[PDB]
Design a protein around this ligand. Structure first.
Ligand SMILES: O=c1ccn([C@@H]2O[C@H](COP(=O)(O)OP(=O)(O)O)[C@@H](O)[C@H]2O)c(=O)[nH]1
Length: 358
């Protein structure tokens, strides 16, 4: 009988991370005839939506002490007490600060367990990166995160790259018929610059040679700026806006039907699930080679392309070649190119990364 604690600061209760965590917990609580999972949250308030925890046993440390030294002390004490009630074999920290908490509460509680980091954002784009050193071993969702962890003096031997899961699909979205315009897809929150750089998307497409259309599924405060920019660039007649969609891939299947490539032009990403989703439907992806995720998914010339951050010329080149057919991606084999990301194999590799360190 083995018990796994998943711990972190309170989250919103909606987000890719929550979805991954709940699925990994439900999967564990079946695995070996249910080996048990619980959660512990460090909270300043009870504003976390609880829906995603419906079937998940969780406890909380509440402290809104304004001085962080005292709040952390209180957190560590509360977690220490929980550890004594619960006696987990393994503690997995979904953020970096919780590695510190887990480490200090292990010393305080006198309990024996292994601490794993499992961060869901680039260490260099979030607050408490140096707290990663308090975990025993590391579960990297990307090569970039592994690199970031190594940079803090952690041995590559103590870090397993586990990626993130996606569901196997039984439908392929085919390319457009020959002599139809290229069809580009953008799926995500709209930011003109900042993280998403829709500006870069528009600048590239405006410079491309050949017939193309762009389908944009998403919304954000920069909608009007982005529409204005498309008008400025003289491309508005080739852009179709869907706004926010609850079922983007249903819209793709039912309304768009044929896709040349999904495009992502981001300055950075926590984990670009959109790329994975696209490749699960056999859609090739042209992405900025940003921290982090795209380089672990995209195999240049096989399921899409990578361009160096800011290399808009390179992006344009990638576009031109897929529009002309100079480079062709085979939609029928693209789903097989992300084998290690599919739910069952992902979980197998994740499970082995944990139990191999014991
Ligand atoms: O109109 C949309 C646009 C995006 N997404 C989903 O949002 C996720 C990532 O989008 P985003 O760029 O917002 O990343 P985040 O900021 O949420 O990390 C993906 O799983 C998409 O399928 C969606 O459901 N509807």
């Amino acid at each position: 009988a083995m018990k796994i604690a998943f711990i972190g600061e309170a989250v919103s209760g909606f987000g890719g991370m929550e979805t991954v965590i709940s699925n990994v917990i439900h999967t564990f609580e079946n695995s070996s005839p249910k080996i048990n999972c619980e959660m512990f949250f460090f909270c300043r308030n009870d504003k976390m939506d609880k829906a995603w925890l419906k079937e998940i046993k969780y406890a909380q440390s509440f402290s809104n002490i304004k001085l962080s030294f005292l709040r952390r002390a209180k957190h560590v004490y509360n977690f220490s007490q929980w550890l004594k009630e619960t006696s987990p074999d393994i503690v997995i920290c979904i953020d970096v600060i919780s590695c510190l908490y887990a480490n200090k509460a292990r010393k305080k509680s006198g309990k024996h367990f292994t601490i794993f980091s499992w961060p869901h954002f680039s260490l260099d784009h979030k607050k408490h990166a140096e707290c990663i050193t308090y975990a025993d071993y590391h579960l990297a969702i990307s090569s970039g995160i592994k690199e970031q962890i190594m940079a803090r003096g952690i041995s590559a031997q103590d870090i397993s790259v586990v990626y993130n899961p996606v569901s196997i699909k039984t439908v392929i979205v085919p390319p457009p018929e020959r002599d139809k315009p290229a069809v580009f897809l953008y799926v995500g929150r709209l930011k003109f610059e900042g993280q998403k750089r829709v500006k870069d998307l528009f600048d590239g497409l405006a410079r491309t040679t050949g017939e193309w259309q762009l389908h944009i599924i998403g919304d954000g405060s920069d909608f009007e700026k982005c529409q204005a920019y498309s008008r400025e660039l003289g491309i508005e007649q080739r852009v179709i806006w869907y706004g926010w969609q609850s079922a983007p891939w249903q819209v793709v299947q039912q309304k768009i039907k044929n896709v040349t490539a999904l495009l992502l032009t981001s300055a950075f990403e926590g984990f670009p699930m959109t790329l994975l989703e696209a490749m699960s439907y056999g859609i090739p992806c042209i992405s900025s080679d940003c921290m982090s995720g795209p380089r672990d998914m995209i195999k240049p010339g096989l399921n899409g392309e990578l361009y160096t951050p800011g290399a808009i010329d390179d992006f344009v080149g990638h576009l031109n070649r897929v529009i002309s057919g100079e480079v062709k991606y085979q939609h029928d084999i693209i789903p097989g190119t992300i084998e290690r990301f599919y739910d069952v194999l992902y979980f197998k590799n994740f499970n082995n990364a944990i139990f191999s360190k014991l």
